[PDB]
Amino acid sequence: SYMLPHLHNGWQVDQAILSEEDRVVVIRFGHDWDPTCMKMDEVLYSIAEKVKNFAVIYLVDITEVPDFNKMYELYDPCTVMFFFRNKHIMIDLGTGNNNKINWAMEDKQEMVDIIETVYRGARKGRGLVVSPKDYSTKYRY
Amino acid sequence: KDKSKELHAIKERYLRKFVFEWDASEDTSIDYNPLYKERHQVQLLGRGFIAGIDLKQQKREQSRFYGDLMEKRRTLEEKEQEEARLRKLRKKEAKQRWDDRH
């Protein structure tokens, strides 16, 4: 029920992302009252217990912190930016915008695999990393 | 062919990729019934003048049944008046054709 930590102030999120060491800071931009964003928050809550050792999730509200809306072009719901090691990582998953996941993951295990791949890429030092599962298609059929 | 056409008609009754323009596969006017396929054009007894059809061509394309019947039924005075009217019309047509390609 959206009990994850939330950035009341915009600058607080900035220093929270800055205060990172050997961990990935998943800043989930959006609004809790949105239904798709509610599903994304529920998925993040489910993941949080399993991967709290290196993956920290820290939500934020666009209305509360609108200064970062124009910084990374935050104009969609469910947006996720893996701002890790003080470096905005390039997560490529077969999408045009390979630096933003703006829709709730269908399954928790997929998100866990994605976040651990992001951690591996960040620790290796590369600023870009690909996804084992391409999302160019939704596998609707 | 017409008998077989009626046969399969009764059988049927009872038993992205962008396109530049329309296709002819959607035509529905194909009816084997000769009465429906060949419909008598409504000439209104010499009074039917379709909009886009050329007036001179329509007069030529007219079946002239009404015209012939009117000529037969016209009296001697009526025939004289019709002859004078058509003579004046021919003179006017000559006047217009003189201007064209002069």
Partner: protein, 56 residues
Amino acid sequence: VVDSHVQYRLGNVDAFQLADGLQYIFAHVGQLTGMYRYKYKLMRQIRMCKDLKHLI
């Protein structure tokens, strides 16, 4: 369209061809601009325009 009227007004081609070119452009926008990709529905308009021109 505006430039066609401009070149008509500034002499050039006569008014009969002006009307003919207006007719063509109105009934060939699909070819001229290819709205197909810009909008799929517009194809309907252009295709029917061809139909009306077909009759015209």
